[PDB]
Amino acid sequence: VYQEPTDPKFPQQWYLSGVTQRDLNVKAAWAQGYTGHGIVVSILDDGIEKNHPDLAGNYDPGASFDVNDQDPDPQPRYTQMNDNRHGTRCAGEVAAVANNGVCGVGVAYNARIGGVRMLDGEVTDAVEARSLGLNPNHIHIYSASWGPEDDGKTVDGPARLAEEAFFRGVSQGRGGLGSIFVWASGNGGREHDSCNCDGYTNSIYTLSISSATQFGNVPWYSEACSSTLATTYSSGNQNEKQIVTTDLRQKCTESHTGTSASAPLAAGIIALTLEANKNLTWRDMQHLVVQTSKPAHLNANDWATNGVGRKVSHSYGYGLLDAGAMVALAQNWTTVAPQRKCIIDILTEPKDIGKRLEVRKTVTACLGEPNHITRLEHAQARLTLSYNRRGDLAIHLVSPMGTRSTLLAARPHDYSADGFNDWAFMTTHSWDEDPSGEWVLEIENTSEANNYGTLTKFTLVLYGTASGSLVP
Amino acid sequence: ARRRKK
Ligand SMILES: [Ca+2]
Ligand SMILES: [Ca+2]
Ligand SMILES: [Ca+2]
Ligand SMILES: [Cl-]
Ligand code: NA
Ligand code: NA
Ligand code: NA
């Protein structure tokens, strides 16, 4: 019989297990025998306290580096306000040691854990690339709780070196199975930010993770968008409990919060899943997340059923991660076929936007060709357009099976006149649908002002396979 | 003044 941990703060880790069903079902995976043994996770952040009493026994120097000062030791820089505590808190969520009389436990408490010190300095494109491409035949899973500013007016993503690091990672990393990149979807909720305006979360190569409060609500800081894949618990109001983890100066904290705490919990659950099947590819892992995540009792006003009968939301993706279900489904999972890519250039001429524009196009999805796709994964609408006030635009895309994805909601603070320059808006909401048929793009002015502009390019990019489907 | 934020 499995014996649950005895650590002094484990009873306060409400999100790991309980009778209530408001948890991530992690104890069920522990009882099947999976605790993370043999898996390696790296925290890309402001450093890691490698001598912390709840981290030292799992610390792995092969998963660590200091990019800011160019040395191998990722120890954080100590200051009066404890500014560099962020990475240490994230690491303890993944892999804090169990049954040692100290603080609580990680999701994957027997996994090996490291850190890249890269936020404590100027974060250039080169700095990101060296961190994402660190030791890719040793590190399995990378976790990033940072990104572009959440002011609700920025449009920004990885530059050339960073994007090259993503493609190298998923292609040649982990022995050719592909690095696993986990991302926090953002903290811009109060600014009405959209996580599709962030190229790191919007990327097909990252698993973008949102947050739910203890009582099952959308937190104040949460950003909605179509590129989010799934959700884990984090903080909410002051009557709701928070996240328990390792803190700077060898302390324990019960008040870790925000989008920053959701991605490390997902990285831990992915570590358990990899232990149950080491042969899973980067795309396999996203299939497992789509099939096993749980919507039940997450409150939102936009829940919709897609073409294959799955519930999906722009606040939550496919819902809460389920650790016990992930490791069960992983054990006899059959590897997916190689990824195909079908490119469809939609427009024959530019179109004025005006008050409202609708573009309809029937596609065959590369019928007759080696990249024919009948089973969709990610879809992108790559748009080039000019407009006088960018944040007044709302953009929607409808798939042939009837699924409406919000590519862009209104952003009140976005006054830019710079438009979008081939920006690849991404949606996960049509996963496993047949993409043959009519697609519809809608662009509208949500304000009463007399705005003007022109849509000059619309490329629909489809990714997926032509085999292996399951009954909806 | 920062390109990337925690
Ligand atoms: Ca150092
Ligand atoms: Ca402990
Ligand atoms: Ca954001
Ligand atoms: Cl590609
Ligand atoms: Na490969
Ligand atoms: Na992503
Ligand atoms: Na169709």
**Are residues A338 and A243 part of one domain?**
no
Residue A471 lies in a domain: no
Give the H/E segment covering residue B2.
none
**Are residues A377 and A274 part of one domain?**
no
A259-A260-A262-A268 Cα dihedral, nearest 10 degrees = 160
**Are residues A67 and A200 part of one domain?**
yes
Q: Which of A122, A145, A148 sits opposite B6 (nearest CB)?
A: A145
**Are residues A370 and A405 part of one domain?**
yes
Distance to chain B for A225, nearest Cα, Å: 20
**Are residues A395 and A300 part of one domain?**
no
Fill in the amino acid letter for A205: Y
**Expt. technique:** X-ray
Residue A436 lies in a domain: yes
**Are residues A267 and A285 part of one domain?**
yes
Instruction: Say if residue A210 carries a ligand binding annotation.
Output: no
Of A331, A347, A369, the one marking the end of a domain is A331
**Are residues A119 and A262 part of one domain?**
yes
- As given in the structure block, the two tokens for residue A197 are 């305006």
CB contact under 8 A, B4 and A119: yes
Distance to chain B for A126, nearest Cα, Å: 13
| Structural domain count, chain A | 2
| Å from CA of A335 to ligand 5 middle | 13
Residue with tokens 């069903």: A21
**Are residues A361 and A262 part of one domain?**
no
**Are residues A129 and A162 part of one domain?**
yes
| Å from CA of A103 to ligand 2 middle | 5
Residue among A319, A335, A268, A295 nearest A29 (CA) = A268
**Are residues A356 and A320 part of one domain?**
no
Among A85, A118, A122, most B C-beta atoms within 10 A, so best to mutate, is A122
Q: What is the CATH number of the domain that holds A54?
A: 3.40.50.200
Q: Which of A128, A148, A260 sits opposite B6 (nearest CB)?
A: A260
List active site positions of A.
45, 86, 260
Of A331, A363, A382, the one marking the end of a domain is A331
Residue A134 lies in a domain: yes
Contact A37, A130 (CB under 8 A): no
Instruction: Say if residue A193 carries a ligand binding annotation.
Output: yes
**Are residues A65 and A23 part of one domain?**
yes
Residues of A in contact with B5 (CB under 8 A): 146-150
Residue A470 lies in a domain: no
Residue A472 lies in a domain: no
Instruction: Say if residue A392 carries a ligand binding annotation.
Output: no
Resolution of the structure, angstroms = 2.1
Task: Report the 3 state secondary structure along chain A.
Answer: CCCCCCCCCHHHCCCCCCCCCCCCCHHHHHHCCCCCCCCEEEEEEECCCCCCCCCHHHECHHHCEECCCCECCCCCCCCCCCHHHHHHHHHHHHHCCCCCCCCCCCCCCCCEEEEEECCCCCCCHHHHHHHHCCCCCCCCEEEECCECCCCCCCCECCCHHHHHHHHHHHHHCHHHCCCEEEEECCCCHHHCCEHHHECCCCCCCEEEEEEECCCCCCCCCCCECCCCCEEEECCCCCCCCCEEEEECCCEEEEEECCHHHHHHHHHHHHHHHHHHCCCCCHHHHHHHHHHHCECCCCCCCCCEECCCCCEEECCCECCECCHHHHHHHHHCCCCCCCCEEEEEECCCCCEECCCEEEEEEEECCCCCCCCCCCEEEEEEEEEEEEECCHHHEEEEEECCCCCEEEEECCCCCCCCCCCEEEEEEEECCCCCCCCCEEEEEEEEECCCCCCCEEEEEEEEEEEEECCCCCCC
Residue A122 lies in a domain: yes
Of A267, A298, A331, the one marking the end of a domain is A331
Residue A275 lies in a domain: yes
Range of the domain at A439: 334-465
Q: What is the CATH number of the domain that holds A426?
A: 2.60.120.260
Residue A289 lies in a domain: yes
**Are residues A322 and A398 part of one domain?**
no
